[PDB]
Scaffold this active site. Structure first.
Site, PDB file in Angstrom:
ATOM      1  N   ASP A  11      27.373  48.206  45.691  1.00 46.83           N
ATOM      2  CA  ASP A  11      28.061  49.258  46.414  1.00 46.83           C
ATOM      3  C   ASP A  11      28.706  50.021  45.247  1.00 46.83           C
ATOM      4  O   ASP A  11      28.652  49.554  44.102  1.00 46.83           O
ATOM      5  CB  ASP A  11      29.129  48.618  47.301  1.00 46.83           C
ATOM      6  N   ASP A  13      32.047  52.647  45.560  1.00 43.51           N
ATOM      7  CA  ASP A  13      33.508  52.727  45.702  1.00 43.51           C
ATOM      8  C   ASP A  13      34.135  51.349  45.827  1.00 43.51           C
ATOM      9  O   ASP A  13      33.734  50.556  46.666  1.00 43.51           O
ATOM     10  CB  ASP A  13      33.910  53.543  46.931  1.00 43.51           C
TER      11      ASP A  13
HETATM   12 MG   LIG Z   1      33.055  50.135  48.794  1.00 43.07          MG
END
Ligand SMILES: [Mg+2]
EC number: 3.1.3.-
Length: 164
Positions: A11, A13
């Site tokens: 992922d 962020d």
């Molecule tokens: Mg995230």
């Protein structure tokens, strides 16, 4: 044997960097004269400390790496990967809005890797839930990625592939 995954997916962020790219920063970005990465508002943009080595380590272990992000700030997310010289560590990037089941289905199609042989790191439980339904070993993280988190994560994958 310690089963190593055939694909590691990250992922973005709060996984590779401590912020939401569609909220805390103002794209586009650029490298400053002092070597730092900056956004339109002069913010110093930084990755979690050990991210470069985490990705390099996977490369050393022979594990292909991909990105899976739901951000709407697509060009901004992509540019950060480039500026941080991380492009060389990824074989695929799925960066666009939507449930990550989509990102993973496309990764499966492009790489041919069965979902069961993938390990995924993400800080949001909803993504862990959605993607976990595919058989992917999902590592729910906190405080971002680090070498320790990577080790524990691979350990978790090896144990799952060993009946644990
Ligand atoms: Mg995230």
């Amino acid at each position: 044997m310690t089963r190593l995954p055939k694909l590691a997916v990250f992922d973005l962020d709060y996984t590779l960097w401590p912020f939401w790219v569609d909220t805390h920063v103002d794209p586009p970005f650029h490298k400053s004269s002092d070597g730092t990465v900056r956004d339109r508002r002069g913010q110093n943009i930084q990755l979690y400390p050990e991210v470069p080595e985490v990705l390099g380590r996977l490369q050393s272990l022979g594990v292909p790496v991909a990105a899976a992000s739901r951000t709407s700030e697509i060009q901004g997310a992509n540019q950060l990967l480039e500026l941080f010289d991380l492009g060389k560590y990824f074989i695929q990037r799925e960066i666009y809005p939507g449930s990550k089941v989509t990102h993973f289905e496309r990764l499966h199609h492009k790489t041919g890797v069965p979902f069961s042989q993938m390990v995924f790191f993400d800080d949001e439980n909803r993504n862990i839930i959605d993607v976990g339904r595919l058989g992917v070993t999902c590592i729910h993280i906190r405080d971002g990625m680090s070498l320790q988190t990577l080790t524990q994560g691979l350990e978790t994958f090896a144990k799952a592939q060993a009946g644990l």
